[PDB]
Amino acid sequence: TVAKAIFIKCGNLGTSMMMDMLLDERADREDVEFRVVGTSVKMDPECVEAAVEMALDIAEDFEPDFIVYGGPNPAAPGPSKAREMLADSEYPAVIIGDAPGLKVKDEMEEQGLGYILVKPDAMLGARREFLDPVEMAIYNADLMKVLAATGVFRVVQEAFDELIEKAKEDEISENDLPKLVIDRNTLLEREEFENPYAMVKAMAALEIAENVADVSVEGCFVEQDKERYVPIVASAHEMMRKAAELADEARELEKSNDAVLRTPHAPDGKVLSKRKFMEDPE
């Protein structure tokens, strides 16, 4: 069977940027097929309706087993609009969001939606005096490094791989929808790292990343004096840069013991595994 899903991207989060690609890293999967639609960075109610409508329009022919809405702050006006529309749709739907989604965790279960809220997927320092396209991409670069090297992306990968296998027995029930909150302590229940210091360095990275959001929030929404708010948002970016360096250090430790976890997909979709560099994944 070919399992299918539609991904909807409104606004930008590090996780929503990569979510579809984590499931087919070499485009060699024979068991899945995805369509991806969105309105780029705009996530006002007008644009978000427009984007979900598109997805629902596509869904008529594509017939996906589930839909995913990925974007900042599921509690915001435009994202709230998407949850409602997806709540009302026949389609199982999963919401990927950041820490502010916690305000509506309770609502989302009520609405029968699944969710993955990634606390270290932090808001950047969005002030005109500091944030231009290059700085925005540099931030995302650092953030991607953190969410990848700490193993956060593997948690998301595994959630969706589990969902996809259930879709292959065609019956995704709401009992099957992910309900995950990801943060520093998530690493404590995983077997991601063979070396414990790699693990603690990743935890440190995730803690720093999750602290960034507080700083960005003070600089964009609270501080009104530019002499103070520009330095504040800039410090946020400096923190994320160090978070990335910590995550790289963790990965380098796993390398020093030839113990880097790789979990690639096989053409049939099965998730393989390996630790040693020259061992075949199995």
Ligand X SMILES: C[C@H](OP(=O)(O)OC[C@@H](O)[C@@H](O)[C@@H](O)Cn1c2nc(=O)[nH]c(=O)c-2cc2ccc(O)cc21)C(=O)N[C@@H](CCC(=O)N[C@@H](CCC(=O)O)C(=O)O)C(=O)O
**220 scored as a contact of ligand H4M (CB under 6 A):** yes
Minimum distance from residue 178 beta carbon to ligand H4M (Å)? 21
Residue 82 and residue 56 in contact, taking contact as beta carbons nearer than 8 Å: no
Footprint of Ca ion on 66-105 (CB under 5 A): 84, 88
2 binding a copy of itself? (CB under 8 A): no
The interface with ligand H4M within residues 98-157 (CB under 6 A) comprises 123-124, 126-129, 136, 140, 143
Q: Given candidates 1, 25, 30, 174, which one binds Na ion under the rule CB under 5 A?
A: 25
Give the one residue of 131, 164, 177, 213 binding a copy of itself; rule: CB under 8 A.
131
Could you tell me which of 261, 22, 262 has the C-alpha nearest to residue 159?
22
Based on the shown chain and the rule CB under 6 A, indicate whether residue 14 belongs to the binding site for ligand X.
no
Among 154, 172, 213, 216, binds a copy of itself (CB under 8 A): 154
Select the binding partner of residue 118 from ligand X, a copy of itself, Ca ion, none (C-beta < 5 to 8 A, by kind).
none
Shortest separation between residue 276's beta carbon and ligand H4M, angstroms: 16
User: How far is the C-alpha of 215 from the C-alpha of 127, rounded, in Å?
Assistant: 13
Contacts of 112 (CB under 8 A, 6+ apart): 87, 174, 177
For strand 32-38 and strand 66-70, is the pairing parallel, antiparallel, or unpaired? unpaired
Instruction: Please state, in angstroms and as integers, the Cα–Cα distance from residue 75 to each residue in 16, 71, 106, 267, following that order.
Output: 16, 11, 11, 38
- Which of the choices Na ion, ligand H4M, Ca ion, none does residue 195 contact, using the CB cut-off of 5 to 8 A by kind? none
Alpha carbon distances (Å) from 32 to 28, 166, 172 = 10, 13, 15
Residues pairing with 69 in the sheet: 8, 95
SS3 category, 19 = coil
Contact letters (x/-) for a copy of itself, 169-188, by CB under 8 A?
---------------xx-xx
CB of 49 to ligand X, least distance (A): 14
Binding mask 93-132 for ligand X (x = CB under 6 A): -----x-x----------------------x---------
Instruction: Mark 23-62 with x for binding to a copy of itself (rule: CB under 8 A) and - for no binding.
Output: xxxxxx----xxxxxxxxxxx---x--xx--x--xx----
Instruction: List, in sequence order, every residue forming a beta bridge with 34; answer none if it has no partner.
Output: 5
Contact 66, 91 (CB under 8 A): yes
Which stretch, 6-14, 27-35, 89-97, 238-246, contacts Na ion (CB under 5 A)? Answer: 27-35
Q: How many residues bind ligand H4M (CB under 6 A)?
A: 19
Residues that bind ligand X (CB under 6 A): 11-13, 27, 41, 43, 72-73, 75-76, 98, 100, 123, 221
Q: Rule CB under 6 A: which residues touch ligand H4M?
A: 12-14, 21, 25-27, 41, 72, 123-124, 126-129, 136, 140, 143, 220
